[PDB]
Amino acid sequence: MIETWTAVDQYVSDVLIPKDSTLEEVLQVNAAANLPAHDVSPTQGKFLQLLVQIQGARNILEIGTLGGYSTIWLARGLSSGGRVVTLEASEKHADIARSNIERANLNDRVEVRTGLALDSLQQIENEKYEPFDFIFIDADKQNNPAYFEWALKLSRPGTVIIGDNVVREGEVIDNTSNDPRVQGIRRFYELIAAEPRVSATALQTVGSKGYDGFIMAVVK
Amino acid sequence: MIETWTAVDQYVSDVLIPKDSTLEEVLQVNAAANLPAHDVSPTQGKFLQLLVQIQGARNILEIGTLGGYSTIWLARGLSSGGRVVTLEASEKHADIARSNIERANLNDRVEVRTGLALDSLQQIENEKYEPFDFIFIDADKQNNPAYFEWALKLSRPGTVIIGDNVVREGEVIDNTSNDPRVQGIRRFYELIAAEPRVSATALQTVGSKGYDGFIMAVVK
Ligand SMILES: Nc1ncnc2c1ncn2[C@@H]1O[C@H](CSCC[C@H](N)C(=O)O)[C@@H](O)[C@H]1O
Numbered sequence: 001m002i003e004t005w006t007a008v009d010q011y012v013s014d015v016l017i018p019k020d021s022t023l024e025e026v027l028q029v030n031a032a033a034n035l036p037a038h039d040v041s042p043t044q045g046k047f048l049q050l051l052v053q054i055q056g057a058r059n060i061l062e063i064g065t066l067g068g069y070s071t072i073w074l075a076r077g078l079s080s081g082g083r084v085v086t087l088e089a090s091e092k093h094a095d096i097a098r099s100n101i102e103r104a105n106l107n108d109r110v111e112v113r114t115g116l117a118l119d120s121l122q123q124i125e126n127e128k129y130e131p132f133d134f135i136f137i138d139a140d141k142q143n144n145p146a147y148f149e150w151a152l153k154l155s156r157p158g159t160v161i162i163g164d165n166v167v168r169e170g171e172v173i174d175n176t177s178n179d180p181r182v183q184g185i186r187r188f189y190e191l192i193a194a195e196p197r198v199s200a201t202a203l204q205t206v207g208s209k210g211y212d213g214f215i216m217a218v219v220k
Numbered sequence: 221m222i223e224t225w226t227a228v229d230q231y232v233s234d235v236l237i238p239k240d241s242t243l244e245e246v247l248q249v250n251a252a253a254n255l256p257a258h259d260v261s262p263t264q265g266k267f268l269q270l271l272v273q274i275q276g277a278r279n280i281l282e283i284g285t286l287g288g289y290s291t292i293w294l295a296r297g298l299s300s301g302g303r304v305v306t307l308e309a310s311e312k313h314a315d316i317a318r319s320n321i322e323r324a325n326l327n328d329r330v331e332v333r334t335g336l337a338l339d340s341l342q343q344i345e346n347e348k349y350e351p352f353d354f355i356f357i358d359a360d361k362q363n364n365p366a367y368f369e370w371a372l373k374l375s376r377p378g379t380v381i382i383g384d385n386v387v388r389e390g391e392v393i394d395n396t397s398n399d400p401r402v403q404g405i406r407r408f409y410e411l412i413a414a415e416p417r418v419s420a421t422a423l424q425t426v427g428s429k430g431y432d433g434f435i436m437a438v439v440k
């Protein structure tokens with residue numbers, strides 16, 4: 001099945017996504033730096049870019065930078081004078097991400113903050129940051145419950161929240177699993193349901209990265 | 221396999237989509253009337269509703285009504301004096317859709333036009349309809365090329381176009397397919413690539429309806 005899903009994704013990108021030497025280099029540098037290949041796929045990246053454009057987002061919060069691949073897709077969807085604030089725990093990942101954001105000529109609208117996301121989120125609250133209108137949660141999924149609460153806290157009515165990798169090859173329905181990622185993801189779904197101010201759905205996806213999925217939520 | 225995808229969708233729906241007796245009735249009536257089970261899934265329907273809300277769409281065009289299941293999800297995403305115009309070739313389907321839409325108390329927001337979509341689209345242009353901000357193509361896929369051209373013609377900068385069922389169990393990559401629906405979808409991808417005014421991506425999805433996918437495009 002992975003061969004078929006990968007072939008379909010190759011077809012989709014070949015026809016709908018013009019070759020982009022900049023983004024290809026980002027992945028190449030990530031690999032050279034030994035960063036894991038956990039970036040969103042090209043089709044997922046374009047989905048994010050287009051969703052940002054549909055929302056007309058101007059203040060994006062991303063949790064989990066890696067090498068800035070998703071960050072570039074997101075930043076490219078920004079309105080006028082919008083910006084992206086992305087959080088990364090690894091000093092090395094963050095350094096590489098900054099270099100890739102530089103190679104994409106987006107350093108004028110993207111800020112990479114190094115440190116554990118929970119600590120950075122508190123700092124963001126402490127500082128004078130306007131509410132975020134688009135939030136992409138893509139870090140350590142075991143912490144999704146806390147990231148969701150922070151996302152809502154730092155949101156405004158109409159804010160879009162995308163939570164990546166929330167199906168995990170179907171492990172999401174294994175209620176007895178002792179895996180913290182699975183339990184964290186399940187609590188993420190539950191907390192969204194508990195919040196009357198948030199309405200969401202989740203689509204299961206397949207492609208070059210395998211069988212997974214994402215949550216798309218909107219703050220009332 | 222399909223068992224896992226179905227179970228995951230059941231989980232997602234159970235937690236994120238509150239029970240809706242109105243929509244349950246809609247599907248029951250569609251089935252009693254022997255309509256094919258081609259309605260979007262509940263999670264796909266909510267995805268459409270949320271996307272409509274994110275864009276803040278006010279004038280929706282849907283091609284392919286069936287029993288009005290997707291139509292209701294779309295209409296529920298509207299707010300002010302928003303409207304939905306949906307096209308259906310089957311007189312029987314159209315009347316069942318009008319009935320379901322009425323039971324959902326949305327007849328004031330939805331217009332179901334009976335007839336071949338290509339004929340109705342010409343009429344819509346002839347008439348003074350305002351440009352459509354959101355277009356859902358979900359009828360006979362062999363005609364997607366023509367529907368895409370009409371969508372572009374009746375759009376405005378920023379219009380969102382969603383094309384459903386564009387992966388079809390992975391057959392979309394088979395250029396030699398004897399399925400006119402597969403050829404129609406391939407023609408659709410190609411035309412999008414040939415239209416500079418449209419940027420798109422496609423995500424492959426799995427769930428209760430099986431392995432398929434959708435295209436999301438934005439008009440520039
Ligand atoms: N507690 C935490 N705070 C911030 N980043 C964290 C974290 N735990 C893990 N991460 C970071 O989560 C990232 C997940 S991969 C991020 C990929 C990126 N969104 C893309 O599309 O390419 C990694 O870079 C990892 O170092």
Ligand SMILES: Nc1ncnc2c1ncn2[C@@H]1O[C@H](CSCC[C@H](N)C(=O)O)[C@@H](O)[C@H]1O
Pocket residue numbers: 258259260283284285286287288289290291307308309310313335336337338358359360
């Ligand atoms: N040429 C044409 N013009 C208009 N509708 C057409 C058509 N060819 C097929 N259809 C209609 O396409 C519909 C596809 S199923 C539509 C389902 C609907 N989107 C939902 O989510 O519930 C059927 O009702 C079929 O009768």
